[PDB]
Amino acid sequence: SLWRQTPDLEQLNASQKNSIGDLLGIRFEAFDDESLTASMPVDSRTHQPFGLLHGGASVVLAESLGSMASYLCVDTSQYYCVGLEVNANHLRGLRSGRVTAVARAIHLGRTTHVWDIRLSGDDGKPSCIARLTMAVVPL
Amino acid sequence: SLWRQTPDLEQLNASQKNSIGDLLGIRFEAFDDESLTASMPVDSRTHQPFGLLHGGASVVLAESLGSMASYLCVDTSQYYCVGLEVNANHLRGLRSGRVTAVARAIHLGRTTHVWDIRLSGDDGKPSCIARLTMAVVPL
Amino acid sequence: SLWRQTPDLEQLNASQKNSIGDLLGIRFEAFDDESLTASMPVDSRTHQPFGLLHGGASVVLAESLGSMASYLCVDTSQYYCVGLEVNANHLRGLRSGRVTAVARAIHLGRTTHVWDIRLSGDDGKPSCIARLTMAVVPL
Amino acid sequence: SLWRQTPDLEQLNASQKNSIGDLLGIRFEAFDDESLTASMPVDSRTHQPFGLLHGGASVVLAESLGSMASYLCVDTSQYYCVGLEVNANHLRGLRSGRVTAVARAIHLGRTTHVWDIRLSGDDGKPSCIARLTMAVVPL
């Protein structure tokens, strides 16, 4: 419904080769008509120095997810999307397991996209909430 | 002036072992009475899938830098600091070289710290601006 | 369910006397177990100079609504709540009618609250999305 | 220097007639080659119900100031500017006197502008910091 390109999880994951998403173990997990989901491990790759998930790593996940979502929503033969503004509240710390982000659209305009991204640890309790504004730019 | 613990760059860099900062090559570079500076490479470790610096990686740098700055400003025998809210505008893309962040204090309160963090590529032009709110929490 | 103090719309409205909410015609309209709703006129009181709803006025509505929601959730004999951080995306312009905001909780912690606030004009299309962080402060 | 149209404080003030800025007593006060300054009373017009400056009112001031700054920087025969994203940290409460905002440019791009807006009460201590993203839109 939301998507122009039907998401293919294998393809999404493969596109990350040689980029931070691959390095951090970000995995696109699921999608439906209204959302796209990706997860990331909470370990030494994503920890800050006191053994908690680094808040910036949560934002890497959010922006990876939202950027990919935007990519799937535009005519890629005429446009590309880059992040313009991002913000996040850090709600709960995580030490282990994985953190899962779900992206939903707030607004898909001609020049900007705004995504609502909700993160939670394996216990299912909200860990982070982010909002991401993407600029839509002519090729 | 700002600092409680005088920053020692060697020590800052070493504290990152086995955390994302180490993995991404974040390097604490300089400090003075009013600021703390760190840089990060722009390469396959920090790229998004189209060869640009991932916006989330800019935020990892900003939050690494600001969190460390907060750590240096509190009585660590009674308090620790965790990120509470972060936001950033993405101003210009970067493809190579390093991105350098400079953190300056907006407000150091008893329960929150607010940091102004300015990022730029090797050409010196502003690439990202972030603001980070840290919560100050009793041990 | 969310609430400690059961919302009473008359008191909420009456409490705005001699404050900006009264000046701008903010009206608390509705509530349920999970949300609180207020609306505001789009007119000369809330316009910017070009005849569109001022983006700051959208934020006054959001912050009025979320701050009141926080007040209804804390023990007011021991605590009061103040805005700590606010952010908003301006999605669509509005010229007339009313703008309606709905607040839902993202997280009610011991020291901070985070509210999701969605605004729309009379056509029902999203016009602004805000996120508000409140500090919970001992009297 | 920053400016395309040279700021004229009388016109800026006069232009607010029949809009929220006039209602709240926003006064454009000063400018130089790099900044624009406006102030606002802290009184019943701008209070929240507990007698503190409403955090949204701080944002009205910031967005009025930054939007006017954008208008003075674009070619107004081809473009107009609207708020796209705004965020603020509320640093200190204010009860009386005036709050003064100073706007400085972070980035004036072709399609977006980013403004740094610093607010303080009459004691000169930082009371709020805002960042505003404006969209540049063809007429």
UniProtKB/Swiss-Prot annotation, chains A, B, C, D:
Q: Entry's Gene3D superfamilies?
A: Hotdog Thioesterase
Keywords for this protein: Hydrolase
State a single Gene Ontology molecular function.
Answer: 1,4-dihydroxy-2-naphthoyl-CoA thioesterase activity
Write down a Pfam family by its short name: 4HBT
Q: Which family does the similarity line name?
A: Belongs to the thioesterase PaaI family.
- What name does the UniProt record give this protein? Putative esterase PA1618
Entry GO terms, CC: cytosol
**Native source species:** Pseudomonas aeruginosa (strain ATCC 15692 / DSM 22644 / CIP 104116 / JCM 14847 / LMG 12228 / 1C / PRS 101 / PAO1)
Output the superkingdom of the source species: Bacteria
Name the InterPro entries for this protein. Answer: HotDog_dom_sf (IPR029069), PAAI_dom (IPR003736), Thioestr_dom (IPR006683)
